[PDB]
Amino acid sequence: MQANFGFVTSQTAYVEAGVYRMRYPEIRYPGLIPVDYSAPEWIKTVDYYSMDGVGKAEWIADRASDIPVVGLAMEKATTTVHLAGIGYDYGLEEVNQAIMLGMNLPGEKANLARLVYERMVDRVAFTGDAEKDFKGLFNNGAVTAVSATTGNWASATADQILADFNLGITGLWSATNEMVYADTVLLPSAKHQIIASKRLGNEATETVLQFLQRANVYTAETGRPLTIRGMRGLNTAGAGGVSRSVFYRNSPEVLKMHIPMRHRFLPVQVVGLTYKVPGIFRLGGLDIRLPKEVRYVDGY
Amino acid sequence: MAPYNETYASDYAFAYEGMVSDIAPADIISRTVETSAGIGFGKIVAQGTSDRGCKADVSAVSPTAPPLGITVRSQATENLTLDKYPRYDGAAIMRKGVIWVLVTDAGGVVAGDPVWLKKSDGTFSNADVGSSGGLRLAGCRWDTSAANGALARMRVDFDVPPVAGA
Amino acid sequence: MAPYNETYASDYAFAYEGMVSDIAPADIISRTVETSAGIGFGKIVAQGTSDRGCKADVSAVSPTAPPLGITVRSQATENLTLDKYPRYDGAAIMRKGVIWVLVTDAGGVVAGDPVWLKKSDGTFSNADVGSSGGLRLAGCRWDTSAANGALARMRVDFDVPPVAGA
């Protein structure tokens, strides 16, 4: 590559009008984590309540006033919101040399700033910073992490694969007193693909990934297929650098992420033939309110 | 539609060779390039013979003749030299801000370290070379942990006189 | 209508613990608080282990590992710690301006004096303690005559390396 804003082109050549940017892994947080941005800007905390009630119903008589009563109680919890920023700057003759070439430097530095903002939001959502203690989905220390029943998923028959995969869903179903079913499953990339292309038995027609899509606790009784999604950063997240997989329910009442301020550009300040535009965005960390509805299994 | 040098990177890189990081203060100084070949972007420069010129040759800097500063990435530079300031050109030296530079050390650097200049080539490192061929830029410090041959940002102040180390 | 802590003062006070006094230059630096408890407003800070963090513990600073700067009074700080930067928060360190700080010396200070740091607690004074437990912030000076335990403004420059004093 080069950084000169100027290229030597021939007069008998065609200059194809296509901007090809370099490739990066996809954004992948939208649709895997619920994000709600409705808090007023420059708030400092976020509050949320609960509610629980008790009562009993008995048999009464034509005159005996045995009618019982009900009661209520509440509890409150809180989280926080922090500030960060990124922005660009440029010289005078740089932008004037890019203007007579039809480049629009101020508008070409905003596209990439938005892109890197999305990158930052993704990194905050799916892992932690250890500067604000923003525990991520893949490393939250408040959820239970168990080990697989001797399954390396390489040189392993599909009996072991099925047992290990159903271990996560059977271990989360009994952990909530048989009330909730796993909705989505995130596996390491290396092992989402070993299980994606092999047959159940020596003689079969379906793959061990296509078998657990259905034929599980969640998909047969309620009628939707289980979202076995293949993930990127789970390859070595684990107890001893071993792969982790995550089973969870994916509702706004389990997970949340608060972004009060999305991304802002402030006025330009001119200091001696240099223009400096600062950009700020104010967001908080990922919150896992129900830790018993998220399960980690290591060693796949 | 040029797909050469595609590496399918996990996420965006950090910076380029001589890019700055925004902050309120910066002494940026206009000098004229004196070397026959150009001068690279994140490089150290010495005091020229033209009373406002600079050279890329820092083999003879001393506490009595301290280095002048560090060039910055300009992005509008005559398109004949790829990423350099051509001969007879405004150089834009910086001597107060925070700038990304290239690391030349075996074990790498961490957050707060001394900055040592190797006079032979003009490369920055963590410790002295050991044969009266290195200076210490007294007011200078790192700001990033980086491995060998990687980009790290450092904070620089060239008004503090250098220290000779044998 | 709160009249507690009424002293019927003769005239307005001078400043608060960590307030700044206006001037064109200031390096204000964003760091993340690493100590379990917060960090006070006009306080010295050391270099953290998080590559951008800071600690209030300066018991091990040396000329090789100089202190990082001085925090400033923010006035928007989470209202759970009274006047502090809570854990995991932007710290706003300053290292160039003029700032009001607290004096810890028997005889007080006058206009132009050296600034000595006591590594044991992290308090500023006029002269060295005398048991290899004090540093001199080489580029630093006072700007007000003040008695013991009063507020005095000082001018600070942290790019100059400190001096060890036994």
XYZ file of C-alpha atoms in Angstrom:
632
model
C 0.000 0.000 0.000
C 0.871 3.687 -0.083
C -0.233 6.992 1.393
C 0.227 9.715 -1.235
C -3.281 10.706 -2.461
C -1.816 10.665 -5.961
C -1.419 8.018 -8.645
C 0.252 8.132 -12.055
C -2.243 6.858 -14.626
C -1.978 6.544 -18.390
C -4.227 8.398 -20.820
C -5.301 5.272 -22.747
C -6.278 3.298 -19.634
C -9.655 2.707 -18.018
C -9.958 3.425 -14.291
C -12.573 1.073 -12.848
C -14.871 2.773 -10.336
C -14.892 0.258 -7.509
C -13.811 0.748 -3.907
C -12.674 -2.638 -2.582
C -11.904 -2.520 1.118
C -9.998 -5.138 3.063
C -11.931 -7.993 4.656
C -12.502 -8.385 8.389
C -14.645 -10.890 10.327
C -18.293 -9.956 10.300
C -19.917 -7.845 12.985
C -21.901 -10.787 14.404
C -23.234 -9.084 17.530
C -26.575 -7.910 16.029
C -28.978 -10.782 16.567
C -26.839 -12.674 19.068
C -27.131 -10.103 21.888
C -30.047 -7.798 22.720
C -28.947 -4.149 22.672
C -31.284 -1.370 23.829
C -30.329 2.303 23.560
C -33.080 4.349 25.167
C -31.479 5.936 28.215
C -30.960 9.716 28.137
C -27.466 10.784 27.145
C -24.829 11.305 29.847
C -26.555 9.154 32.427
C -24.296 7.483 34.965
C -26.202 4.367 36.101
C -29.180 2.204 35.122
C -31.782 0.878 37.574
C -34.207 -2.024 37.262
C -36.817 -3.568 39.554
C -38.420 -6.963 40.207
C -41.702 -8.077 41.785
C -42.918 -11.166 43.647
C -46.232 -12.055 45.260
C -47.630 -14.615 47.713
C -51.177 -15.832 48.320
C -53.394 -18.804 49.078
C -56.965 -19.792 48.194
C -59.272 -21.630 50.597
C -62.873 -22.819 50.825
C -65.349 -20.399 52.396
C -68.871 -20.647 53.825
C -72.189 -18.773 53.707
C -71.143 -16.668 56.708
C -67.675 -17.649 57.932
C -65.245 -14.962 56.750
C -62.263 -17.207 56.053
C -61.267 -15.125 53.016
C -57.451 -14.983 52.798
C -55.304 -12.118 51.506
C -52.288 -11.607 49.243
C -48.951 -9.857 49.653
C -46.302 -8.190 47.510
C -42.590 -7.361 47.699
C -39.950 -5.743 45.470
C -36.173 -5.627 44.964
C -33.922 -3.276 42.959
C -30.608 -3.666 41.112
C -28.258 -1.362 39.208
C -25.526 -1.146 36.550
C -23.301 1.609 35.122
C -22.357 3.485 31.927
C -18.943 4.724 30.751
C -17.407 7.048 28.147
C -14.925 6.513 25.311
C -14.002 8.186 22.055
C -12.183 8.126 18.738
C -11.793 10.726 16.020
C -9.731 12.052 13.143
C -7.660 15.065 12.104
C -6.081 16.391 8.928
C -3.886 19.106 7.484
C -4.855 21.993 5.235
C -3.154 21.254 1.936
C -3.877 17.531 2.414
C -7.632 18.107 2.343
C -7.311 20.709 -0.408
C -5.296 18.277 -2.541
C -7.918 15.590 -1.935
C -10.763 17.991 -2.818
C -9.537 18.716 -6.357
C -9.372 14.942 -6.892
C -12.966 14.378 -5.767
C -11.989 12.438 -2.631
C -13.847 14.198 0.231
C -11.388 13.487 3.062
C -13.771 14.663 5.841
C -16.437 12.239 4.616
C -14.003 9.383 4.014
C -12.709 9.575 7.600
C -16.245 9.218 8.964
C -17.074 5.920 7.243
C -14.062 4.195 8.778
C -14.684 5.838 12.162
C -18.194 4.377 12.234
C -16.727 1.005 11.245
C -14.175 1.025 14.073
C -16.924 2.150 16.476
C -18.905 -0.972 15.582
C -15.707 -2.973 16.124
C -15.356 -1.541 19.633
C -18.985 -2.280 20.501
C -18.530 -5.874 19.335
C -15.382 -6.386 21.404
C -17.103 -4.988 24.488
C -20.152 -7.207 23.981
C -18.408 -10.530 23.365
C -15.476 -10.202 25.793
C -14.078 -8.005 28.534
C -11.735 -5.045 28.886
C -10.491 -5.381 32.501
C -10.453 -1.581 32.552
C -14.128 -1.129 33.379
C -14.706 -4.758 34.438
C -17.074 -5.278 31.538
C -17.387 -9.046 31.760
C -18.308 -10.495 28.380
C -20.511 -13.360 27.287
C -17.565 -15.732 26.775
C -15.791 -15.091 30.096
C -18.413 -14.083 32.674
C -17.350 -15.572 35.991
C -20.856 -15.831 37.472
C -22.081 -18.744 35.318
C -21.311 -22.432 35.725
C -18.634 -24.072 33.581
C -18.484 -27.865 33.446
C -16.290 -30.247 31.448
C -17.270 -32.589 28.637
C -17.433 -36.347 29.196
C -14.104 -37.217 27.534
C -15.016 -35.765 24.158
C -12.397 -34.356 21.800
C -14.727 -34.511 18.765
C -11.774 -35.789 16.735
C -11.521 -39.581 16.540
C -14.810 -39.658 18.467
C -17.850 -41.636 17.382
C -21.160 -39.837 17.031
C -22.483 -41.511 20.181
C -20.025 -39.435 22.203
C -20.778 -36.300 20.172
C -24.518 -36.630 20.779
C -24.009 -37.332 24.483
C -21.700 -34.333 24.903
C -24.004 -31.963 23.032
C -27.079 -33.108 24.947
C -25.089 -32.710 28.169
C -25.340 -28.931 27.890
C -29.092 -28.897 27.317
C -29.797 -31.545 29.972
C -27.543 -29.724 32.443
C -29.305 -26.397 31.951
C -32.822 -27.861 32.017
C -32.343 -29.372 35.483
C -30.405 -26.318 36.705
C -33.550 -24.160 36.469
C -35.817 -26.804 38.052
C -37.074 -27.981 34.642
C -38.500 -24.605 33.589
C -36.356 -23.233 30.731
C -34.877 -24.638 27.513
C -31.682 -23.655 25.738
C -32.265 -21.496 22.665
C -28.850 -20.922 21.076
C -25.500 -22.694 21.215
C -22.108 -21.189 20.316
C -19.245 -23.585 19.512
C -15.599 -22.984 18.602
C -14.941 -22.593 14.892
C -12.541 -25.536 14.720
C -15.155 -27.924 16.102
C -18.358 -26.538 14.616
C -16.870 -27.819 11.360
C -15.694 -31.269 12.481
C -19.308 -31.991 13.533
C -20.804 -30.415 10.406
C -19.769 -32.992 7.811
C -19.639 -36.501 9.315
C -22.315 -39.177 9.364
C -24.029 -40.427 12.508
C -22.951 -44.030 12.005
C -20.822 -46.057 9.636
C -23.976 -46.267 7.488
C -26.237 -43.214 7.625
C -27.464 -40.293 5.552
C -27.426 -37.281 7.893
C -24.632 -35.403 9.620
C -24.215 -35.156 13.381
C -24.840 -31.422 13.036
C -28.079 -31.987 11.109
C -29.211 -34.477 13.757
C -29.002 -32.156 16.780
C -30.571 -29.302 14.836
C -33.771 -31.179 15.691
C -34.253 -34.177 17.986
C -33.487 -32.240 21.158
C -35.410 -30.922 24.142
C -36.157 -27.487 22.661
C -37.031 -28.172 19.016
C -39.543 -31.032 19.187
C -41.991 -29.889 21.866
C -42.225 -26.247 20.759
C -41.509 -26.535 17.044
C -38.575 -24.334 16.098
C -35.033 -25.489 15.152
C -32.110 -24.978 17.532
C -29.654 -22.267 16.476
C -26.300 -24.041 16.540
C -24.156 -21.085 15.488
C -20.445 -21.222 14.692
C -18.367 -18.699 16.591
C -14.875 -17.243 16.186
C -13.249 -16.405 19.523
C -14.178 -19.575 21.418
C -11.219 -21.617 20.164
C -9.130 -21.246 23.334
C -11.436 -19.540 25.848
C -11.492 -22.115 28.609
C -10.024 -23.397 31.842
C -6.667 -24.397 30.369
C -6.859 -22.804 26.946
C -9.378 -25.387 25.725
C -12.440 -24.727 23.611
C -15.634 -23.496 25.260
C -19.226 -23.666 24.093
C -22.076 -21.576 25.433
C -25.716 -22.625 25.820
C -28.272 -19.936 26.590
C -31.830 -18.712 26.160
C -31.358 -15.390 24.280
C -34.121 -13.220 25.707
C -34.021 -9.542 26.726
C -34.735 -10.736 30.297
C -31.487 -12.793 30.374
C -29.034 -10.499 28.599
C -28.937 -6.775 28.067
C -26.526 -4.127 26.830
C -27.096 -0.402 27.316
C -25.659 2.191 24.929
C -26.939 5.656 25.934
C -24.899 7.601 23.356
C -24.108 6.021 20.000
C -21.374 8.140 18.385
C -20.972 11.885 18.158
C -18.849 14.351 16.211
C -17.990 17.635 17.906
C -17.023 20.916 16.219
C -13.640 21.269 14.550
C -10.857 23.193 16.299
C -8.099 24.740 14.191
C -4.559 24.921 15.581
C -1.938 26.237 13.171
C -2.665 24.613 9.795
C -4.179 21.505 11.399
C -7.826 20.565 11.946
C -8.822 18.232 14.784
C -12.313 16.726 14.984
C -12.938 14.756 18.204
C -15.485 11.936 18.287
C -17.062 10.534 21.441
C -19.406 7.655 22.260
C -20.785 6.679 25.647
C -21.736 3.067 26.362
C -21.936 0.564 29.189
C -21.122 -3.088 29.701
C -22.922 -6.346 29.033
C -25.304 -7.525 31.748
C -26.250 -11.153 32.427
C -29.144 -10.888 34.861
C -30.034 -14.579 35.061
C -26.751 -16.507 35.426
C -28.490 -19.873 35.848
C -29.808 -19.685 32.262
C -26.321 -19.544 30.704
C -24.059 -22.591 30.708
C -20.405 -23.105 29.758
C -19.090 -26.504 28.698
C -15.353 -26.899 28.128
C -13.210 -29.450 26.352
C -15.270 -30.200 23.234
C -10.796 -4.032 -7.414
C -7.305 -4.852 -6.200
C -7.264 -7.900 -3.914
C -3.495 -8.383 -3.680
C -1.980 -8.242 -0.196
C -5.217 -9.552 1.311
C -4.621 -11.128 4.711
C -8.219 -11.416 5.977
C -7.321 -9.683 9.210
C -9.299 -10.316 12.399
C -9.858 -6.604 13.039
C -8.458 -3.195 12.150
C -4.784 -2.449 12.649
C -3.571 0.126 15.139
C -1.780 2.816 13.104
C 0.785 3.373 10.351
C 4.481 4.208 10.440
C 4.384 7.854 11.468
C 0.789 8.735 12.289
C 0.064 10.875 15.358
C -2.591 10.438 18.040
C -4.743 13.462 18.817
C -3.841 15.658 21.783
C -4.000 19.387 22.434
C -0.250 20.238 22.339
C 2.099 19.616 19.437
C 5.203 21.413 18.216
C 5.183 20.701 14.504
C 8.144 22.349 12.801
C 8.739 23.031 9.115
C 12.197 22.011 7.895
C 13.659 21.422 4.442
C 14.897 17.956 3.501
C 18.613 17.894 2.724
C 19.398 14.230 2.018
C 19.690 13.163 -1.614
C 17.154 10.399 -1.090
C 14.014 11.208 0.838
C 13.290 10.744 4.524
C 10.840 8.183 5.855
C 7.813 9.090 7.904
C 8.513 7.879 11.404
C 12.225 8.666 11.558
C 14.656 10.748 13.580
C 16.391 13.753 12.008
C 19.485 15.824 12.758
C 20.288 19.497 12.327
C 21.113 20.419 8.744
C 23.705 22.788 7.356
C 21.191 25.154 5.720
C 20.116 26.849 9.000
C 16.656 25.366 8.504
C 17.428 22.007 6.885
C 17.452 18.478 8.228
C 19.284 15.269 7.406
C 18.377 11.642 8.022
C 21.989 10.936 9.059
C 22.233 10.881 12.857
C 25.537 9.035 13.096
C 27.257 12.024 14.749
C 24.685 13.310 17.256
C 25.948 14.041 20.768
C 24.757 15.804 23.941
C 26.385 18.915 22.455
C 24.556 18.451 19.112
C 21.201 16.896 20.029
C 18.823 15.452 17.431
C 16.133 17.710 16.043
C 12.906 15.698 16.137
C 10.764 13.102 14.381
C 8.982 13.420 11.039
C 5.239 12.820 10.687
C 3.100 11.066 8.082
C 1.990 13.725 5.596
C 0.010 11.779 2.937
C 0.563 14.537 0.309
C 4.161 13.971 -0.786
C 4.789 14.269 -4.553
C 3.750 10.621 -5.370
C 7.185 9.903 -6.880
C 8.721 8.688 -3.629
C 6.320 6.180 -2.142
C 6.194 7.156 1.541
C 8.949 9.752 1.971
C 9.626 13.497 1.971
C 11.467 14.188 -1.303
C 14.556 16.352 -1.515
C 13.841 20.063 -1.033
C 10.485 19.691 0.719
C 8.768 20.798 3.896
C 9.420 18.110 6.467
C 6.953 18.711 9.345
C 9.090 17.671 12.315
C 7.351 16.963 15.636
C 8.959 17.257 19.060
C 6.198 17.345 21.707
C 3.262 15.072 20.860
C 2.674 11.326 20.977
C 3.622 9.448 17.812
C 3.592 5.882 16.505
C 7.060 4.542 15.689
C 8.740 1.231 14.876
C 10.353 -0.953 17.549
C 13.815 -2.489 17.063
C 14.497 -4.635 20.130
C 14.816 -8.352 20.784
C 12.538 -8.621 23.815
C 10.161 -5.800 22.939
C 9.052 -2.902 25.115
C 6.396 -2.315 27.773
C 4.442 0.712 28.997
C 7.036 2.843 30.753
C 10.582 2.384 29.483
C 13.546 4.556 28.566
C 14.007 5.311 24.880
C 17.470 4.597 23.500
C 18.626 5.702 20.055
C 21.150 3.664 18.088
C 23.306 6.235 16.288
C 24.511 3.723 13.681
C 21.133 3.326 11.945
C 18.773 5.584 13.881
C 16.493 2.996 15.469
C 14.694 3.142 18.807
C 15.080 0.503 21.498
C 14.733 -0.205 25.206
C 18.344 -0.490 26.426
C 21.762 0.860 25.484
C 23.794 -0.884 22.785
C 26.983 -0.864 24.848
C 29.801 0.481 22.646
C 29.426 4.287 22.883
C 27.059 4.043 19.923
C 23.790 4.830 21.677
C 22.131 7.895 23.166
C 19.301 8.174 25.661
C 16.580 10.646 24.743
C 16.169 11.902 28.292
C 12.617 13.161 28.024
C 10.845 10.326 26.190
C 8.792 7.307 27.160
C 6.814 4.485 25.607
C 3.063 4.088 25.787
C 2.379 0.572 24.462
C 3.667 -2.948 24.936
C 4.889 -4.241 21.580
C 7.009 -7.076 20.221
C 9.973 -6.865 17.850
C 9.372 -5.025 14.589
C 5.912 -3.762 15.548
C 4.361 -0.323 15.935
C 4.304 1.312 19.361
C 3.284 4.828 20.337
C 5.677 6.927 22.386
C 5.540 10.327 24.073
C 8.392 12.634 23.124
C 9.942 15.847 24.416
C 13.072 17.071 22.674
C 13.871 20.133 24.795
C 15.403 17.916 27.500
C 19.092 17.400 26.640
C 20.126 13.845 25.716
C 22.369 11.631 27.830
C 25.437 9.887 26.428
C 25.864 6.249 27.379
C 29.006 4.183 26.873
C -31.505 25.536 53.787
C -28.521 23.741 55.272
C -26.573 25.957 57.682
C -24.245 23.315 59.130
C -20.518 23.924 58.706
C -21.085 27.684 58.738
C -17.924 29.555 59.694
C -18.908 33.118 58.715
C -15.754 33.531 56.678
C -14.233 36.967 56.079
C -14.065 36.468 52.308
C -14.052 33.743 49.672
C -11.574 30.893 49.882
C -8.867 30.382 47.293
C -9.567 26.994 45.673
C -10.398 23.357 46.417
C -8.248 20.245 46.636
C -7.499 19.614 42.972
C -8.863 22.540 40.987
C -6.768 23.990 38.153
C -6.047 27.618 37.286
C -6.660 28.667 33.693
C -3.730 28.777 31.278
C -3.329 27.966 27.598
C -1.299 24.710 27.852
C -2.361 21.565 29.675
C -1.637 17.892 29.090
C -4.703 16.194 30.507
C -4.457 12.429 30.122
C -7.171 9.791 30.393
C -6.212 6.807 32.553
C -8.227 4.051 34.211
C -8.262 3.779 37.999
C -6.803 0.500 39.241
C -6.897 0.772 43.045
C -9.715 -1.005 44.866
C -10.680 2.190 46.655
C -10.874 5.372 44.638
C -8.235 8.037 44.125
C -8.489 11.521 45.585
C -8.518 14.645 43.480
C -5.221 16.360 44.102
C -3.006 13.285 44.355
C 0.008 11.747 42.660
C -0.345 8.540 40.635
C 1.994 5.821 39.390
C 2.048 3.712 36.248
C -0.456 0.865 36.337
C -0.166 -2.694 35.109
C -2.966 -2.411 32.524
C -0.886 -0.426 29.968
C -3.232 2.512 30.508
C -4.089 2.208 34.207
C -2.925 4.105 37.254
C -2.527 3.345 40.942
C -2.487 5.618 43.975
C 0.417 3.598 45.424
C 3.689 5.427 44.772
C 5.777 3.616 47.369
C 8.073 2.126 44.701
C 8.675 5.007 42.274
C 12.275 5.626 41.221
C 14.200 7.622 38.593
C 13.855 4.507 36.420
C 10.069 4.328 37.031
C 8.950 7.951 37.379
C 5.482 8.926 38.608
C 2.789 9.513 36.025
C 1.070 12.762 37.007
C -1.558 14.390 39.212
C -5.326 13.906 39.099
C -7.722 16.836 38.703
C -11.058 17.728 40.289
C -13.770 16.370 37.990
C -17.057 17.176 39.810
C -18.948 14.416 37.906
C -17.812 11.233 39.652
C -20.571 8.656 40.311
C -21.785 10.282 43.617
C -21.083 7.061 45.547
C -17.517 7.996 46.451
C -17.615 11.507 47.844
C -14.659 13.212 46.143
C -12.781 10.407 44.379
C -12.446 8.598 41.046
C -14.115 5.204 41.570
C -12.572 1.950 40.432
C -12.625 1.490 36.649
C -13.071 5.150 35.719
C -11.432 7.781 33.560
C -8.910 9.549 35.742
C -7.936 12.780 33.913
C -4.266 13.039 34.876
C -2.498 16.385 34.387
C 1.232 16.839 33.860
C 1.856 20.350 32.478
C -0.473 22.966 33.976
C -0.662 24.768 37.307
C -2.713 23.005 39.977
C -3.766 23.561 43.584
C -2.463 20.892 45.967
C -2.144 20.290 49.705
C 1.000 21.192 51.659
C 2.573 18.768 54.157
C 5.514 20.589 55.739
C 6.282 21.959 59.185
C 7.499 25.421 58.194
C 5.399 25.843 55.066
C 6.531 26.859 51.596
C 7.219 30.125 49.773
C 7.087 31.253 46.141
C 9.974 29.433 44.497
C 10.935 26.162 46.165
C 11.825 22.630 45.127
C 9.034 20.071 45.295
C 9.860 16.894 47.200
C 7.657 13.801 47.181
C 7.485 11.497 50.191
C 7.185 7.991 48.737
C 5.746 6.542 51.958
C 2.410 8.388 51.751
C 2.647 10.471 48.586
C 2.702 13.968 50.065
C 4.438 17.078 48.755
C 6.910 19.097 50.793
C 9.782 21.565 50.610
C 12.830 19.498 51.628
C 13.968 15.880 51.493
C 12.910 13.475 54.240
C 16.414 12.075 54.683
C 16.170 8.262 54.643
C 16.107 7.377 50.917
C 12.332 7.740 51.093
C 11.922 10.938 49.096
C 12.176 11.962 45.457
C 12.633 15.384 43.909
C 10.308 16.170 41.020
C 12.989 17.931 39.006
C 10.746 20.120 36.897
C 8.267 21.503 39.444
C 7.946 24.644 41.517
C 5.582 26.331 43.938
C 3.617 29.479 43.239
C 2.181 30.516 46.624
C 3.343 30.970 50.190
C 1.281 28.692 52.423
C 1.392 27.296 55.947
C 1.107 23.669 57.047
C -1.946 21.789 55.814
C -3.124 24.553 53.479
C -3.724 24.787 49.741
C -0.949 26.076 47.496
C -0.765 26.179 43.712
C 2.251 24.680 41.984
C 3.524 24.513 38.409
C 4.323 21.004 37.221
C 6.226 19.381 34.368
C 6.540 15.608 34.437
C 8.703 15.057 31.349
C 11.827 16.050 33.306
C 13.208 12.904 34.982
C 13.074 12.830 38.795
C 16.112 12.957 41.065
C 16.709 10.430 43.835
C 17.781 11.843 47.178
C 19.164 9.841 50.088
